[PDB]
Structures are given as C-alpha cells and as structure tokens.
Enzyme design. Sequence first.
Site, PDB file in Angstrom:
ATOM      1  N   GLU B  91       0.630  -1.706  -0.296  1.00 16.87           N
ATOM      2  CA  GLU B  91      -0.058  -0.121  -0.304  1.00 16.87           C
ATOM      3  C   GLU B  91       0.824   1.509  -0.134  1.00 16.87           C
ATOM      4  O   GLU B  91       0.533   2.171  -0.259  1.00 16.87           O
ATOM      5  CB  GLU B  91      -0.980   0.275   1.728  1.00 16.87           C
ATOM      6  CG  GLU B  91      -2.015  -1.628   0.907  1.00 16.87           C
ATOM      7  CD  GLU B  91      -3.435  -0.027   1.819  1.00 16.87           C
ATOM      8  OE1 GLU B  91      -3.943  -0.586   2.736  1.00 16.87           O
ATOM      9  OE2 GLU B  91      -4.174   0.131   1.013  1.00 16.87           O
ATOM     10  N   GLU B 111      -4.474  -9.002   2.845  1.00 20.73           N
ATOM     11  CA  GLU B 111      -5.867  -7.942   3.988  1.00 20.73           C
ATOM     12  C   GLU B 111      -7.007  -9.726   3.563  1.00 20.73           C
ATOM     13  O   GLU B 111      -7.557  -9.708   4.764  1.00 20.73           O
ATOM     14  CB  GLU B 111      -6.338  -6.943   3.414  1.00 20.73           C
ATOM     15  CG  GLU B 111      -5.373  -5.572   4.725  1.00 20.73           C
ATOM     16  CD  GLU B 111      -4.633  -5.202   4.186  1.00 20.73           C
ATOM     17  OE1 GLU B 111      -3.711  -5.154   4.712  1.00 20.73           O
ATOM     18  OE2 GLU B 111      -3.483  -5.691   2.820  1.00 20.73           O
TER      19      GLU B 111
END
Lengths: 237, 237, 237
Positions: B91, B111
Amino acid sequence: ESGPDALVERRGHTLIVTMNRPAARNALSTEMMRIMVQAWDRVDNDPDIRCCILTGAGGYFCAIDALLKGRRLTKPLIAAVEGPAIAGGTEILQGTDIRVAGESAKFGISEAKWSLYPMGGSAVRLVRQIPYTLACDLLLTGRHITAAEAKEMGLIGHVVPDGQALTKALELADAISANGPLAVQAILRSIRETECMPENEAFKIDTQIGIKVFLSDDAKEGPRAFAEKRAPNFQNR
Amino acid sequence: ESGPDALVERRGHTLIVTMNRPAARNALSTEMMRIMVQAWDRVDNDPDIRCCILTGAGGYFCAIDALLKGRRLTKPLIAAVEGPAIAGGTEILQGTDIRVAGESAKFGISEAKWSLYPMGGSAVRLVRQIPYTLACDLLLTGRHITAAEAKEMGLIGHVVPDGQALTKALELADAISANGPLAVQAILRSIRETECMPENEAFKIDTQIGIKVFLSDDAKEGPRAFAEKRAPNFQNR
Amino acid sequence: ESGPDALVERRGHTLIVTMNRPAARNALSTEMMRIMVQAWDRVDNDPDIRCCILTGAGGYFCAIDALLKGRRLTKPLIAAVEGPAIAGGTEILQGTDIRVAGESAKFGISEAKWSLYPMGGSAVRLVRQIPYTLACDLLLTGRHITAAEAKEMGLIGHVVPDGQALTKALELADAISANGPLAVQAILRSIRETECMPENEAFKIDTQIGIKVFLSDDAKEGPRAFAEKRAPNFQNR
Ligand SMILES: [Mg+2]
C-alpha cells in the site's frame, strides 16, 4: 535548411505528414506547426482521408495545436518514429493513437533537466497512457529510453528494424482505411467524449454513438459484404 | 526492538527515510508513523531537499497519513524495496513515484485473506496504476508476487540484485536532484491537480502550472547552462 | 444446436457459467443472455456464492446486460478463455476481473471491419484497462491477437496450456472463496464507486467502505484464525 518545414503526402485514404527539418533534428518551427495544423484540418474535413501518419525526415522524428494539445484529429493518427523522439517528439507521440518505432529510436521528456516544463501536455497524458510509476520515472528523471524499453512500458506498440517504421505504419493505416470510417471515427469520438466519466454514465454516451453507426448505409454494406464473402466498399455514410 | 522506529538521513538534496523495526519485519507502529509524517513535513518545507527515498532496514521493506493516503509529498518519492513488502508495504509503495526492488523482494495485498480491508488506499489506486485485471488479481486473491512479476505488471520500474535497491534509488535521486526542482515539483503538482479531469479541462490547469515554471530564474539558468555547455546550478526560484 | 444456450454449475462457493452454443462458436443468443442474467442474479443474491467463473464450451469462448454493460456482478468474475474470444468474446472479457486463457486463445474486437460498432462497451473500457496505444491498436485495426500478446498487453493475467483455462480459473476461485467475502466484495464495491473520482475524494468513500468491513464478525474471525494458526471459517457477516 531547404524546402517546407513539413511535407504532406497522400497514399490512398491515408494522409502522411513528415516533419522536415532534418538538419535541426526536426525541431519544431512555427512554419512546421502551421503546415501541421492545416494538414490536420485537411484530415478532419476530407471524407476521402481515413487515416493519418506522422513521421519525421532524415532518421529523426522530432527532437488546434502542436502536439495536439486542446485538439485531437477526428481520424486515427499513427506515429512512425525513426531515431530521436526526445522532448517535443515524445509529447507529440502521446497525441497519436498507434505507434511504430525503429529499433534505434529513443524516447524521453528531458524538459526538467533544464528547469523547463513539458508544455505539450505530457504531465496530464503520460500517467494515463502507461503505468503510473513508469510515467513518473520518465517525467521526473528526464532519462532517455530505447524503443524496446518504450514498448515494454506500453508507450508504443510496435518496434521494427531501423528504416521500416513508415512501412509498418502504412500496413496499419491500410488496415484502418479498409475498416468502416464511420465506425473507426465513432470509436475515437467515444474514447474522447467519455474520458474520466464513470462507466455507467459513459455507457449512455457510448451506446448512442454506437447506435448512430448502426443506422448508417455502411453498416449495411459491411454485413452484405461478409455474406457475399467479399471485401466491403464503404462510402462514409 | 532498539532505536527509533524510523531513521531519517540526508544525502545531498535527498532525504532518506528508513522504516526501522527489523525484528518485526518493519511492521508499522505509531512511533514509526509519527517519525514518517514529520520527515514528510521536512521534505515539503526544506527547499534544500529535492528528492525523498523510502526504504526499510534489515532486509525487509514493510510487512497527512501513513501510506500517504489523503496526503502526497510535494517532492518525488522513490521506494527502495528489499525483501517483504506485503500488505502495508505494498500500500505504501503506491504512494511513491519511482520504484526499485531487490530481486528477492515480494509484493502483495493480503488483507482479504483474513477478511480485513486494505485501509491504505490500494482499492482506489491499484487499478489506476497498473492494468485493471492484474490489479484485481492482487487485491482479490491476496497472493504474493516476486519483484520480476511486479515489474512485469508495471507495479515497479526497476529490479536490481538483492541489497542494491537503495544504491539504485540513490542514482535515481541524484538525477532528479540535478533537475530543476521547480519543474520537477510542478509536474507532480499537475499530475495531482488534474487527476480524473478530461484532458481538455486538465490542459488549462497544466498550461498555467507550466508557464509559471518558465517565469522562474531557474528556467533561465537551465538554457544558459546548456548554451555554456555546462551543468546547471538551480536555486529553487 | 442441443441443450440450453448456457449451462450453470456449482463447485463449492463458485458458480460456473458456460456459454453453450459450440456449433456456433458460442455466438450470443437471447436465450444464452437470459440464462446469463439470471445466473448473475443468483451470484448477487446467494450468500453461499463467493466467486463466479465465465467460460465457453467446445474449445471456443464466445465469437443488467450481456457483456455486463450497465451492470457488474457484486462478486469476483473470472474468465476462463479457450479458443476464439473475438468481438463479443473480447467485450465480455472486459467485464471480468481475473482472466485466464489457453495458449491457443485469440482476442480481438473486429466490429469496425464491417462498419459495425462494439456495443458491449469496449470503446469506454479498453483504454482504461490496458495502455492507451495498445487499446487503440485493437479497436481501430480490428486485428486478432494471441493469448501471449494479450498477456503482454495486460488484457489478461494468465496463459495456461490449451484445455487448462478452467482448471487454473478454479484454482483462482478457490483462493478467492477462501478469503473473506465481505472484504473481497467491499474491494470491488470501492473500485466501482470511486471510479473517475480524484483520489482525495475517492479516499473518503474507500475509507468508509473499509471501516464497515472491520466492524464485521468475519473481521474478528480472520485474526483469531491467524493467531490460532488455523484456516478461517467465514460466515459472510
Ligand atoms: Mg487510467
């Protein structure tokens, strides 16, 4: 040095525009740009023209507006790049749709090295046309890349041996010109009209553009030709 | 384990930020994030800084905001990735502009495997930075990829042997820092200001940003240096 | 020829939709499309379905709406392409998220060759999903490409030997179905809701979608499973 700063030639349905200042690596001039803009108007206004090719003379590429910033041709534009396409040459490249380069061609946006700015619109277009981090690398370092690297980045689509860029471009223009001009030009129009519209909103524009094509005479000729197992003969209507 | 959770160092015009919790694979901590945000403010506020590099210590990468969500540095940010860049690390990567990885680095957004969500903005950015279907593959399967695969996807731009990521990043920062800071930073500003604007509207913003650069003193120094066949000496004005 | 124009099958949490007119190269029919739309509603409405696969029978792929224009499934859709995916087949492909092709598969949008228009939305989507100039090449020339070329363009993500497209797709669906359905589906929702929004505006939508996931029971099960070093057992709540 000699002759007009841009040459304009016709080959079937294709108009060929040659940036012609080889002694100056085809660096843009105001006369070159005036010749380019009127060729652009010719492309748009002549129903007989179905495709345009932009190239440079003398083994260089280039090292209503110039790089087609604020204006885009309403018909497909193919770049045939030989040799250096640095700074102005790579900005212009991003206003073309289909892109052929000789093996020895080089690309790059070097403006920032001299604390200048790419006025041809690269800071808007480049991150939209190739992966973000590859675009940033080019724009922020200003480094030059090979045609192979450019194809790897997705910045161009075809690499051919040196000297054959225009030949390959003409093959591609011949395929475009044999397609239905109303379809080809509606696709471009849709791409441009729907830019940055969420797809559910864009689809409404795109559907109406498409249905208009289907209502044409050429949209009957295409299927008739296929059923008659023959090549179609489009009339731009 | 020991020392501050992030180190900040200077090398010429480049500020180097090192995520420093190697015992925990440089997993983000609140102290790591506070050190990162103040380094970010240093980058923005210090005219002497022209480039920033983000890296991790101990052979891991990471496994106003954190991943620069809601905020982006006003100067170029180069990721130097060694080893795992999973979840938080990938990210963060998308908030950097130029991206170097060691050969053994790994990327991934895991995730969803644990029914968590990528809060660092990957679901917005990733499909905009690399081809849609490749982004979807990463986000929805959560699978990890090699640095070679990441470069193939366009997610990073450079793969170097293990241990040389920071070295290559510093080469790239040195090239950026030698460019005109006003030009380099205007390009970033244009990219950010014109996002999701149709290009005819975007070009109006981009043209005004560019003309402002040309009015600077540095825009005179660049051409003077080239004419004097010497390297330019920019003053950020 | 025989049987329903589309077959629907279940494999665990995955629903498999097979375009089934192999005698006609799985050319779309109105019965094929009705079966597809109700399968789509099944995918959306059945909490037990976590993934969908679209494929074709008989060694062809295809040669609320059809190509999912105006509508997109709320759960991931994997294309398994064997053989020709021309015209309709490549438009449908762009409504899928993850894309597997057999080595001998072919792609192309040939509509303009016959002065027809791609009504499935390719003129909107294609330039957004792969590099601009590669998209233009496909749409304007209408030429067909191999699966290898398609992967090179970023149009698909996986090339497998002929006949193994569905097998690989099922591996990918199994990984998706093992992930948290609330997370997987929120990521898709974010991608769709934030399209063409500048990232600072998009991040506000994306953050709220994500926080909602974290409030679920499944977001507690994922971490508990990891701490108990065991596979998670999600309940879609
Ligand atoms: Mg894009």
